Amino acid sequence: MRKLNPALEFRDFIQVLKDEDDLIEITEEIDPNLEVGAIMRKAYESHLPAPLFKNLKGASKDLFSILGCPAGLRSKEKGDHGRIAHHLGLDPKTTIKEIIDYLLECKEKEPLPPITVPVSSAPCKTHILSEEKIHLQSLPTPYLHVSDGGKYLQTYGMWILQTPDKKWTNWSIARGMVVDDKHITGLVIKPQHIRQIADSWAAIGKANEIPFALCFGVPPAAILVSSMPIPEGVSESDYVGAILGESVPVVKCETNDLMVPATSEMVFEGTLSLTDTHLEGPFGEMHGYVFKSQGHPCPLYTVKAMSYRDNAILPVSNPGLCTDETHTLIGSLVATEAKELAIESGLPILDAFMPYEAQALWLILKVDLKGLQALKTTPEEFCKKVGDIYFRTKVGFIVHEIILVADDIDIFNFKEVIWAYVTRHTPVADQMAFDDVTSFPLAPFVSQSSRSKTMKGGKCVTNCIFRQQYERSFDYITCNFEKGYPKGLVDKVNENWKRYGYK
Amino acid sequence: MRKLNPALEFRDFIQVLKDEDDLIEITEEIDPNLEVGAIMRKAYESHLPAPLFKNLKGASKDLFSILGCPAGLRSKEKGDHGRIAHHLGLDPKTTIKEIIDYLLECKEKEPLPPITVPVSSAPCKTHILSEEKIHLQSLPTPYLHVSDGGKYLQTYGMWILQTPDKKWTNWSIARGMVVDDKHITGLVIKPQHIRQIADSWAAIGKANEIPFALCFGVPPAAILVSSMPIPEGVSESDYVGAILGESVPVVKCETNDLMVPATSEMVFEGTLSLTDTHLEGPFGEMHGYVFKSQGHPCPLYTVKAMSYRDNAILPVSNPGLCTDETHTLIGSLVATEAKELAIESGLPILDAFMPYEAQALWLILKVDLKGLQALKTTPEEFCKKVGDIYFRTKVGFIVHEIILVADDIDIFNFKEVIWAYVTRHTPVADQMAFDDVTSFPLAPFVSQSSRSKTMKGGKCVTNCIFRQQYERSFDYITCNFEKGYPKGLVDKVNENWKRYGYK
Ligand SMILES: Cc1cc2c3c(c1C)C(C)(C)CC=[N+]3c1c([nH]c(=O)[nH]c1=O)N2C[C@H](O)[C@H](O)[C@H](O)COP(=O)(O)O
Ligand SMILES: Cc1cc2c3c(c1C)C(C)(C)CC=[N+]3c1c([nH]c(=O)[nH]c1=O)N2C[C@H](O)[C@H](O)[C@H](O)COP(=O)(O)O
Ligand SMILES: [K+]
Ligand SMILES: [K+]
Ligand SMILES: [Mn+2]
Ligand SMILES: [Mn+2]
Ligand code: NA
Hints:
2 copies of one chain form a homodimer.
Chain A: H1 10-19, E1 23-26, H2 35-45, E2 50-53, E3 65-68, H3 82-87, H4 96-106, E4 115-116, E5 127-129, E6 158-162, E7 169-172, E8 176-178, E9 183-186, H5 193-202, E10 210-216, H6 220-226, H7 236-244, E11 249-252, E12 259-261, E13 266-280, E14 289-291, E15 296-308, E16 313-316, H8 325-328, H9 330-345, E17 349-353, E18 362-367, H10 369-375, H11 379-390, E19 401-406, H12 414-424, E20 431-434, H13 444-447, H14 451-454, E21 459-464, E22 477-478, H15 481-484, H16 487-500
Parallel strand pairs in A: 1-2, 3-16, 4-11, 18-19, 19-21
Antiparallel strand pairs in A: 2-3, 5-15, 6-7, 6-10, 8-9, 9-15, 10-13, 11-12, 13-15, 17-18, 20-21
Helix pairs in contact in A: 4-9, 6-7
Bound molecules: the ligand Cc1cc2c3c(c1C)C(C)(C)CC=[N+]3c1c([nH]c(=O)[nH]c1=O)N2C[C@H](O)[C@H](O)[C@H](O)COP(=O)(O)O (2 copies), potassium ion (2 copies), manganese (II) ion (2 copies) and sodium ion.
PDB class: lyase
Keywords: (de)carboxylase, prenylated flavin binding, lyase
Assembly: dimeric
């Protein structure tokens, strides 16, 4: 077999999953109406191999197969974050701390802007359709959850928009559903960059004609950074090229001057209008609910051209209860930038993480106790400082509870996080509300309350640092096997386990 | 061999665990100093078979073996709460919901007070020691955690105290450690009945000579109800009799008038003094810590006699992180009595449970939404009503957060509980503090703060019921595989999973 580069090539990613027995190619006929979404949910929820649906009801031979669960978790024996590690070309047993640390290190690597390659060398240009051949209702788009407001074609593709001055090209994921044979509608919301750039076009009188492209099965490294809140004005493509160690190969669109990854599976191109809008949603989302008939108008994308590979594959994420891409990518990549913001702001933080079990609503910060002790501060002052740093920034938007814990907690292990949460904070008394800050509108306790109208508040910083830990060493014993007993005893016990009679 | 009655006979319980491959007889030499405790924590934390240590360093042929983890959890195939079910003589696969409901059904049965049996055939009277033969320091008492203040002999035996008027005889578990060759010390705290009854002796001038017995390896149903907060004035023995369907067989102590279970493994008898105290603790406890050198003066029990079976077994609980007897018994028996209290107080609660992952600090109340809606109430009023019922009485003593959820949550499954907790309450805004109620002194966020000195407040009711659920039907889709899709699709996917290629 060829040397695989799963960060760079979506098809190498799929092959490396097959080589690790972490991909099931499903060749019986599967219906895109619900059945694909249900198979995906069963696979996410038991951390099972990713389904590749090779035979969808209503598909043509090229349009399309579906790869579900591209950044779902899997069994610990093969690297439970191996699919995420493969998006970055890392070893599959890389830990989540190492994945986050690698993305931070890559911010100081030289950015490598995309390289234009010839069309004859771009698989995405194998088949090219002009406007009259666009028939979006022909595609076997999945209907992913009961009560969704449409069929969501765009759950794990990349939108490409560029500012009118051409200085900033943004790549990002935002959901999109098929409206009719020529149009898609989807979320284009503050504070996201896709709406900052669409607003720039509106500012020069072009709100109804914003060029875009939509790319599926892009280089896995590019879809991952599409989900990451890197700074405004920074083009994702150049940080993707630093992660890959090589410029992303790109080719020009048929109908506009945007550049798309040459190895994309499918590319749609057209114009977005902020003034022609359409009912969108609802859509089963990252906090685990579909709230019925709770759709709202969103901008319309008019598809004017398409190109695709032979035997094209649509990757799909089907959000809901933990754990799927809206936890493993959205939450971990907020945590990556929250670590970067701690570093920029000089907070004494070792690591940050958004536990999957808290549906990407909790951000845990592991605090360096000696650095905290150097501040000679109190919990009330520190909680305020921390909430003021995060809750009025775009990185903090999705977060509703920031939990502060000492450096003896492995924040990437929810068993330690829930222990430290329940045992180390006094309910209410150790929580600081932040009432003026922008609420995240998708949190269900916001959207199903009168807060949905004010859109402020409902966030807190919770102190799970004991008062003594703000001042000095505080040595207690953690009553479990691995931490509670001396290493020589732990090892003796583990060595004799079988001899005792354990089977 | 014999028909086995594990609720009535401690040795039948051990037998029924051996029959279910849930008990490992360790014949090699094990040191009661740490080694026992570490083996036990390994077993609890992976839900492994209980260890029976038949050869402790320092033991005599009779005093003693140790049975660890008598109500730990085990594999789901065997019934994961089967050890708890065998305490009550139920089928091993009975769920914890069914266990709780069975205990509530037993409240309606005829109580059956204990019956005296002949000494001549009571195994607990096989060996009898007079005062001068009592040498507690010669027993192979375990030293269970690093930095415990002593060796804890009493972690899973029953203290027996009776009121001076003889109307009420209480059976309960409270920790106790060896002080010297004749004395034990341990927790005797308000509001527990051991302290209530001791206080009644002090009120008549007998604070320093309160008779007691301490019994190990009692009928398993008796040790379970000893950990249950049944009402004051009710003698546990009479409810144990209702659960067993027969009176508990008892014999009188050598040195006082209390009655002990005839099939006890070991019995210690003597006098308790409230006003002669000794340093007791620290002890690794139910919330997962040993706080070093944080011992405190507790009463002293003087042992004056002791009786025991041939080849006696000491059952031992070694608390810490989830999950051990301090979560499976203390929490679930609080929940049992909390469900009883909701029935008596007219609250619309279907079930109550204290999740093990929350270290028996959280009580979840599953609220029947038709019943709530018939109250025509608001969250603020209902949370006040609920907190006032529970946190102002003994059954709420250990509980620091009561979480209200609707009847779509399976409160016995922490994956559903954590999802409802994070997505359905607004942090701080949907939490009602109770500042004036008694705090649980063992909660670490109480003990390691200045609340240790006031022992008030730090409790909360958290409302995780959506505002529309107080009013009317609110139908939303839960985005997981079993709840999110029509039953017929769930079943088809499960039927086809192997054929798809899932291995
Ligand atoms: C991984 C992922 C990220 C989604 C996402 C999904 C996935 C699978 C869906 C499609 C399955 C559910 C919907 N998502 C949306 C979303 N951001 C947003 O504005 N609208 C969304 O509809 N996000 C997050 C978004 O991609 C990030 O917030 C990026 O930081 C946005 O890029 P930007 O910083 O350049 O604006
Ligand atoms: C199962 C169990 C229950 C313990 C317990 C333990 C276990 C294994 C230990 C020994 C391992 C840790 C310590 N425990 C204590 C305890 N209650 C108490 O007052 N002091 C304690 O030291 N409890 C709980 C106590 O038994 C219950 O609250 C009973 O309701 C008290 O009975 P009562 O209602 O008759 O007062
Ligand atoms: K992005
Ligand atoms: K009791
Ligand atoms: Mn961006
Ligand atoms: Mn009692
Ligand atoms: Na083809």
